[PDB]
Design a protein around this ligand. Structure first.
Ligand code: HEM
Length: 110
């Protein structure tokens, strides 16, 4: 039983460390990284990312839909390549399987 919630938390720490400006697009803009887990906007968003990972594992993920919604937020290939690397670190740090192919699937629609 992978703790995907823990992996996603480390994913966002990696993501926003390397690219702080990405955080500006979220409802938790401006919040200190060490404080994120206590922020209500963050908790909801991280929960949806955990949901997406479990949908991919479970076979129900909609990569086309997720890509389209991110393009709608002006988030594209460059950002998702960066996210891929950040998620790879977060999985490794928790002994979790690599999610590279899930990200590749989103990338194919970007
Ligand atoms: C591993 C890569 C990523 C995954 C799996 C992912 C997944 C998700 C999910 C499931 C949502 C919830 C709403 C929806 O389903 O569309 C979401 C929202 C969002 N994501 Fe991502 N995302 C990723 C990378 C990124 C990156 C790099 C950015 C760069 C800024 C980003 C920006 C956003 C924004 C702005 C929202 C909406 C926030 C809001 O409505 O308040 N995402 N993402």
């Amino acid at each position: 039983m992978v703790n995907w919630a823990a992996v996603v938390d480390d994913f966002f720490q990696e993501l926003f460390k390397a690219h702080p400006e990405y955080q500006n697009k979220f409802g938790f803009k401006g919040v200190a990284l060490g404080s994120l887990k206590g922020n209500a906007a963050y908790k909801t968003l991280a929960g949806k990312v955990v949901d997406y990972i479990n949908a991919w594992i479970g076979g129900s993920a909609d990569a086309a839909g997720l890509a389209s919604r991110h393009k709608g937020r002006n988030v594209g290939s460059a950002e998702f390549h960066n996210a891929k690397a950040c998620l790879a670190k977060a999985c490794s740090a928790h002994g979790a399987p690599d999610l590279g192919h899930a990200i590749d699937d989103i990338l194919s629609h970007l």
